[model samples]
Structure formats: C-alpha cells, structure tokens
Target: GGAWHESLGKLLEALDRPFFWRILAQTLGQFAPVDNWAALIFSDSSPLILSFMEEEEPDPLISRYITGLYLQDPFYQVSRNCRRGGLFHLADIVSEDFETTEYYNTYFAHYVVTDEVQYNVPLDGERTLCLSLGSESRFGAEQIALFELLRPWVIALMKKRIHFEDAV
Candidate 1:
C-alpha cells in the first residue's frame, strides 16, 4: 500500500534533522534511531490487541489487523522513539466501538496522547530530499534531478498547506 524507498527516504530525512534528534532525545532520553524504540513498543503491545477485544466483537479483530498493519508499515518502523505501548493503547481505543460516553471521552484522551507523543517532531526545510539523495550514491543524479522536477510542485503544495496546524 506504500512505497518502501520513498518512505525510507522520508524517514532518513527526518532523522538527519537536529530538531528530530532533539525530539527523540526529549521523548526517549537517548540518541538512537527512533525506529528502534518503535520496534520495542510495537513488539510489547502487539499481543494485547488480541486480548483486549471480546470474542464476539468484530471491532477487536479490525483493531488487531490495523495494529498489525501499522507495525508492518515501513514508516512506523523507521520513525524515531515511537512508543509501541502508546500506539497500541491508542489504536485499541480508537478501533473499538464504544457506545458509552465515558468510553468516548477516554478515546479522545488516548487520541490526544498518541498524537502529541507520536507526531512531536517537525520536518525542516528541504532536508527530506537531501537525505533521500544522500542515501544512494548511484541514485544521486536521479534523486537530484527528480527533486529538481518535483521541487516546484512540492513548494507550491507546502506554501498552500504548511501551517502550525499542519504540524499535528
């Protein structure tokens, strides 16, 4: 459903930024690649997705499937300092169908926590393209050429959509 190269390239770009490193350090209190933390988190809570669901509730299966999808996704695997516990907890709450108002409130709380923790980092400048080009020497020329071709489109889109709200 997604391109690995492109996703990896984007992640590399995020990793190269000082701000991203800052966020990772702030969140995890370390300088390791965020993906390592994510892997640990995903591995820890993956099984809970199954246990949390009632046998008759189809939503639990859907939640489990989505959680697995996220765990398997390259983007999730590459992001720095991603907490799997938080991801799983939030995913379970969101995927489950809660008819009660209290559950709905709890769901929103989980949503906010997940969003705050998971998307705390911000992308800087053209660092994404630069990182992508640097990853493959053979593709250097192609990467730059592609970046050149796409720069205008990218810039235009950014100009229209880039805002404080977009950060979240």
Candidate 2:
C-alpha cells in the first residue's frame, strides 16, 4: 500500500497544475463520489470512481472541478440512468426521441454485459456482488463531472495488463 499511496500522491501533485487544480478543487467539494447513491450502487464494479466520488462530495470546489471532466466524457450519458432506474426501459418505449436510437441499444448492450470490477469482500465467507452505472444521473452538472472524470480510470484499472517490448 505504501507504493500505491506514494503513486497516488504523485498523481495528485501532477494533477495540481493551474488547468486541473480549479477543476479538481471544484470536483472535490460538490460531489464527493462516496456520498453518491450511484457510487454505492456501482462500487463493486467501479471502485476507483466510487471512492473518488465519495471523497470529493465534501468540498464544493472539488465538485465543480470534477464537473469539467464529466462534461467532456460519456459518463454523463450513463449518470442519467443512475438517477432513474427505468431510463433504460424508457428508452425502449420512446425510441423516436433520440436521433439515432440504434446507437442507444448498442451502447446499453455493452454496459449490461460488460464484466465489471468486483469490490465486495467476503463477509464470513459469503460473497456479495454490486451493480455499477446502470445508465442514469440524478446529480447536478458538477457532481456528474466528478463521475465522468473517474470513468476512464475505472476502465483502465479494470483491464488486464500485459508487458511487451516489441511488436511486428
């Protein structure tokens, strides 16, 4: 955990530049991802973001900072689902509202079937598996951005790593 902690500190330092500092500060203040229902619901599959979101919600500045990241990414699309359970079902009913509804189906297919991260530890030898983003958002722009900034990191952390020197 020492190395991980050190790396995290370095990562934070690196992210402290003028461009990211305000965003990060704003992000941390308003949304504190852990406090988010979406983060709790999806923690098992997306622990990294869940942890970040929980921690960021305490400070309003951090929340605003994270919003920038959210606005720039696709997580916003899914955060909407977190707010409303039936959004996926609603999309099924109102296909015409979307410009290209087929894309929605394709996107949902990936989200539902994707093999996500497992966060629950065994309690007395029992296992627990939690759900991740289901396709919705209930938070404001700033809060949503915090989740969005975390999405990429979640995906990357969940991926299996391989080392190779050269490829031909």
Candidate 3:
C-alpha cells in the first residue's frame, strides 16, 4: 500500500490543475498498460466529458463526441447495467463481431484503441463516473487484478469529490 499511498498524493493534489494533470498516471502505471485515459460523467449513460488525456491525430474528437455522437457509443450502452460498479472490457459488453460493426468502423475507428475497459463509480439514478483506460494493444489479467484493487479507493474518492462539489 506504500505505492498506492504515494499515488493518492499525486491524484488528490492534482484536483486543482486546469486539465486535472496526469493524475492517474502514477496509479495506472503501477498496474496496467494504459495509453489513454478519460473520466466522464453520465446520466443514464449519456456522457458529459469531465476531462481526459488522450493520444494524437484526431481532429475535433471531443467535439464530435459531445455533439450527439456519444449516444451512438457502445460504451454508454454498456454502462447502464453496471450500477454496482466494476471493471469491464469492451469485449465483455459488446458482440464478438462488434469491431466489424458500422459504429465501430465509423466513429470508433477514429480512435486507435485496441483495448478498452471502464470502471464505473455508481451514484443515484445510476449516475456514473466512467474511468476509461485504453490502448492500441490488449491488456492482460494482471491489469484486471490491479483494477479490482483500485475499486474501493476510486469509489471513495468519487463520492468525496461529489460531496465536495455539492458543498461548494
């Protein structure tokens, strides 16, 4: 837990950053091969981009996402059933041939993600804070194990932030 404690220091202190810093970098580095990261808030899986740190070569990606393209997103659909909050792969939610689907070819293709997974921090009305980790290659079992270890901490921090926001 020493490493985790140090990682928490980076994350919490980073709250005041303009783009939230690379707050999760230390934490994720300890566990997985995360190439891109984003946090989003969802009311029934219709997401509002809270913030993100993503990779290159997409012109106006966030704009495209917020501008109705998100409703067509498979991740949002998958999030609805996960109120108790856990980690899941894109494969766990989508079809075996989902990558060949029109939605994937059209919008999802724009992002270079070969592996995508999300951790949902659930709240009332199943409002979710989706923490997504993605890469151009697949993640392994070790990553899921670390992700499970991260669950309670994420949930507690999310709840704390929500409470702090409401107080402000």
Candidate 4:
C-alpha cells in the first residue's frame, strides 16, 4: 500500500547515499517501538557493525565483539550453526547461565536490553546478515505480532541493500 511505497522510496534514496542508517531507523520505528537497533554482518571469521540507531556510541561494544566476544554471543552462536534463514529471539538461544557469565557483564549488561529479537538471513557460507531490534523494556504480544507482520519487509530490504552494495 501507500506505506510500503513510501518506505521503498526512502530505501531507494539510501541506495545513492549508502549511509542510510537514518532512513532504516525510521523504518524500524514504523515496525514497532524499539529502544535501539543495529545491523551487523556476521561470518565464521569476523563480525562487522554496518549501521545502528542508538543514543550513545556503541563502538566499544561493536569493537569488542568483532575482536573476540562474538564466540560467546547467543546470536553469533545461532548464526554460526544455522544452515538456513530464520528469525529468533535472544532468550531462546542464550545459554541458561548466560547472565552469570563475564561476557554478559562486559558487553550485554551495559545495554540493559530487556527485549531483543533478530532476523538472520544467510548471504553465503558462514556469512549472514543479522538485523536486530532491541528495547530496554519488555516485549509482548503486540510487539511480537508486529514483528511477524514486518519480518518479510525488513529481510527483503536487508537483502536488497546487500545486493546494492555488492554491485556498487
């Protein structure tokens, strides 16, 4: 409908600029109320922070994870093992005792994340595009339902951008 066309227009604008984090962030706002959001490229070897929408700098968080902590991240673990595309919630994949680990205190705790959901699509062997949406508040039926509704759009746009970037 009109919303899709409008969203598509903004994303198209981003193709020329490429640093369209602002446009993507607004699109996330249209999906659901997220406290923060980020897009990361994950592979068997390394992870890259492509873009994000956050109040403060997340460089330290991103750098630390890219350097080493990815191995311990629940999302990373799931992405590494999965052979196909899927959507996931952090709660389901994280270890039972994750909260007690040093990694949690060092990285995840700082974000105070209360609800985090992700969509991971495989781009190639051991390489996946992870679009994660997080909030400091708990997610409920409304949020999850919204996610279900918007999942396809988000993943399509993500894949399109990757193709756009590769071609450019």
Candidate 5:
C-alpha cells in the first residue's frame, strides 16, 4: 500500500490524460468505498455524461439521467445557483419535501439506495462538472471527513482538466 498523498500525486500527473477521472475514482476508492461514480457536465440543457463507472452489476438508471431525468435531481437544481465549488451530500442538498416528489419515488429512491455525494466544480456560468459518488450504505463521519480533506485538491485538478485537449 502507498501513502494517500502518493496516489494524489499520480492523479495530478495524469490530469492531462484522458484517464484523469478514472484515476480520480481509483484514488478515492483507495480511501473509501465508491459504489458508483460519474463525471457529468450539468447545464441548462440535458446533462452530458463525461465519464461513468459503476459496480459490477451496474445501475441502469444512469442512462435515463442523461435522457433528461437530471432536471429533477437535487444536484442539478443546485448547480445552476452554485457560484463556488465544493463537496455536497445529497441529504443536505435536498429540500424538506424532496422525498415526496414523484422523481424521488420513481427513480432516485431505487437508483441511490443509501447515499450520494458530489464534488461540484464550476467551469462556467452555465456548466458545472459534477463528480458524483454513490454508495450502497450510508457514509460514515470518517468517510465524509476524508472527502472534505481531499476536496480542495480534487476541485483544483478538475478545474484544470478543462484545459486539456482530451478533457472537457
């Protein structure tokens, strides 16, 4: 096993390559269980799927997300108004009555069975690249703290990703 910072260095070194997101996922996985993950560009229009990864038994609803279901997602609603970028938990972002919404019952409930967190990196006024992490179990305090500790570096590199030819 290697020190956590070593993995982060590799992630930074690979930022200019097409596999940055993949390395990111792996780096995070080294610390926590990332049941599912994705890099998506959120905008006024349908969200674009920059990259996606899932457990061996993949969740099929991700395809539906790109097909227009994203408009109802909590993160999507917040992305437009979010001026800065950082970590966010699904629980904190949802509205008081979010659970009762049709979208939640129909899709989100089944899609995200336990928890979801995201690193929102604002690229422009209309677009934010969301690095979403989903889990089959509730995230513990340590896991959340680890994510928070790594948030700054993650946000910085994700912002840098836009300048690379293969990224965006």
Candidate 6:
C-alpha cells in the first residue's frame, strides 16, 4: 500500500504536466514489468497516439499506424464499436482466424510479438482511451492477476487525466 500511495502521489503531482502519460506508464512498470506500452485515443473516425514506449525510438510501427495501419489492428477494430470499458487481453479479443490475417502476419507478429493486455476506457459514446501493455513472451499468471487487480484504479486515473488534455 505504501508503494501504491507513493506512486499515486507522484501521478497527482504530474496530473496536468506534459509527461503525465510517461509518468503513469513508469508507475505501472514498477508493478508489472511491462516491456512495451502505448496509449491511444480512438475516435469515431480514427485513432491518435497519446504516448508510446517500446524501448525503441523512431518506431516505424507507430508511424505506419498513424498513416493507416490501425485499420488492420484488431484492437482498433474492436474499439470502433465498443461503448463499454473493460480490461482485455489480445488473446481474448482477437478473431479465431486472427493469426492467419495479413495484418497479423505483416505487422502485429513482427512488432507486438507474443502478448498484450489493454485497459479500454470509454471517453464518451464515440471515443475511447486505450492503454496497452505488451510483452515478447506470454504474461505470467501473477502479472495478469496483478493487472486485473489494478484495473479499476488504472481506468479511473485515465478518465481523470483525459479531462486535462484539451488537445484531445
């Protein structure tokens, strides 16, 4: 509880700052060891990247996504019609034939690799904010459980933070 409160204090301090998203992710990393993370805003027509952290810069995947690759992302596909917010794992949301799709083979497989979990928080009827955590290997049972336990807190913070982002 001490660590959580400490991290919570830090997040509150960074609430309206430019680096809030990155600070938020770092706070999560302290708990889950997530290797890759990205935050996205999905609207009625398109998606926008709020932040991305994959231990790599000049990430072509994000560039391609902004240009149009998101059309092929399963997460984007699912978010397009979802009005409710929840925690979802890549395996839980992907179509049965997902691995066979060109999008999976060409992009997801090459970049996201093995596992991903997302916190989908709806902003309004037609918009959602999604924070994704990815790994090169499957997430361990303990990590998944930790994520679930922290889900509500994560969602609430996301909602609060979005209210401060006038640009969005």
TM-score of each: 0.21, 0.23, 0.79, 0.83, 0.82, 0.85
Candidate order by decreasing TM-score: 6, 4, 5, 3, 2, 1
**lDDT of model 3, residue 150:** 76
lDDT by residue for model 4 (1-168), tens: 778887778777795465665577567667666777777888867787777675344567767877897778788888878768687777778889888776688867655367687789888886889877777877677877777787887777777777655432
- TM-score-superior candidate, 2 or 6: 6
lDDT of 3 by residue, 77-154 (tens): 666766676777877788676766655766576563687877777767767777777777887887777777877776
Q: How far in Å is the alpha carbon of 59 misplaced in model 4?
A: 4.3
What 10-residue stretch in candidate 1 is worst by lDDT? 128-137
Q: Judging by TM-score, tell me the better candidate of 1 and 6.
A: 6
Work out how many backbone clashes candidate 4 has: 0
Which run of 10 residues does model 3 get worst, by summed lDDT? 159-168
Error of 5 at 5 (Å): 4.7
Residue pairs clashing, model 3? none
Global lDDT scores for all candidate models:
0.28, 0.31, 0.67, 0.74, 0.79, 0.79
lDDT of each residue in 1-168, candidate 2, tens digit only? 566466446445534232222333333334443222222222222212322323432654334324442232233334333432211222332324343543334433333232112122111122111223332323345545555566454333222111110110
Q: Which runs in model 3 stand beyond 4 Å of their true positions?
A: 1-4, 19-21, 44-46, 55-58, 163-168
Mind sharing the TM-score for model 1? 0.21
lDDT over C-alpha atoms for residue 161 of model 5: 82
Instruction: Tell me the number of clashing residue pairs for each predicted model.
Output: 3, 39, 0, 0, 0, 0
Query: Is 2 or 4 the stronger prediction by lDDT?
Result: 4
- Shift in Å, residue 115, candidate 5: 0.5
Q: Which ten residues in a row have the lowest lDDT in candidate 5?
A: 54-63
Model 6: per-residue Cα lDDT over 1-168, one tens digit each: 577788789988898887888888788777675777788887767687777775345767667776777777778877875668687778778888888776677667766778888888988888889988877888777888888888878898899988788778
What lDDT score goes with residue 96 in model 2?
49
Q: How does candidate 5 fare on TM-score?
A: 0.82
